[model samples]
Structures are given as C-alpha cells and as structure tokens.
Target: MPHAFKPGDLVFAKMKGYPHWPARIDDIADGAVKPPPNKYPIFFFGTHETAFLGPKDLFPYDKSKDKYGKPNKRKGFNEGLWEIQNNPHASYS
Candidate 1:
C-alpha cells in the first residue's frame, strides 16, 4: 500500500515501542518505521476505544458531551485526563 499517513493529518495511531509522540513521529519520518509500520497506535478511554484517536493538534479532553448534553457522566473527559473504564478488547486482520 502507498503511504497512508501524513504529518498533521487526523490520525488515530499510537507510538510504538516509545513512551512519547515526538520521537515516534521522527522515527516514522526517516523510514525508521517501528515494527514494519503495521497498524495505527492504540488508546482507550471509557466506552470509547480505538487504536489511536487523532493528531488533531488541539486540546482533546476539554470539550466533550454526554447523551443528555450534560457534563455529568462525561465530565472526566474535560479534565484533560482520561481513564480506562474497561478491559481491553481487540481483534486483527
């Protein structure tokens, strides 16, 4: 497949084998794709789950809504910190 990612694009990938974002981007940039560049990065919060969720370049946890349009149960997302509310469940191709 051709390159599927670009810097600044909305990406939901996790930084592999690294504890930070900047280094991972650098590695991928110079063809040092960690682990064959297999799949997107992973992150999980509450019932919302994904391999990763965005290179949005914006504050992510400060503005979210719940079903009632209230911040009651969803207020945690606005705290700039996310919590793992469930066990991980995943599959692969």
Candidate 2:
C-alpha cells in the first residue's frame, strides 16, 4: 500500500525499536530543490526531530485513541514552537 501524505499532514512516524509517534510532513531546507523521495520528510512532535521515512513506517495519528497518550513535550517546548509548513518542497534524496 502506497501511503499518500502531504506537507503539514499529521501522522504517526515509526522508527526501529520505537512505538508510533506523532509527526508531521515537513521540508528539509537543504534538500528543497528535489522532489519528494521514496521516503518522506518528517518532523516529529515534542522532540522536534526530523528524518526521512518510508510510507510503510507511517500511520494515521489519532490522539483520541493513542495508547501512548500525548507526545513527550521537551523542556521549554510548547505548541507555539510546533509550527507546520503547509507547502514544503524537499526530499530525502
């Protein structure tokens, strides 16, 4: 199944040895000249980390039924700092 997600779309990002975590489609400024790659650009919530992940590693994020509950907010972090870019132009290539 090919997962289709656009920039700013909310989803869960899965990494090795970790449970699905809240994340958003994002842009990597340095890679902005290329098209989206086989792996999508992702910006994680709370931790504010970024990575490139394949669609197979992504799942729909529904907070209402999240077993992990809310994401772990980092020190001095708040909603204001978690901004989503609706129009991203980048890739993992």
Instruction: Compare the candidates by TM-score and give the number of the best one.
Output: 2
TM-score of 1: 0.21
Per-residue lDDT of model 2, residues 1-93, tens digit only: 544787767776778866566667775467464445587877776566778888788776554224543434544123312332222222313
Candidate 1 least-lDDT 10 residues: 18-27
lDDT scores of the candidates, listed in order: 0.27, 0.58
Q: What TM-score would candidate 2 get against the native?
A: 0.58
TM-score of each: 0.21, 0.58
Deviation in angstroms for 45 in model 1? 0.7
lDDT of 1 by residue, 5-89 (tens): 4332221123354212110111133553343334433333332333432344212221221221222234233221222112212
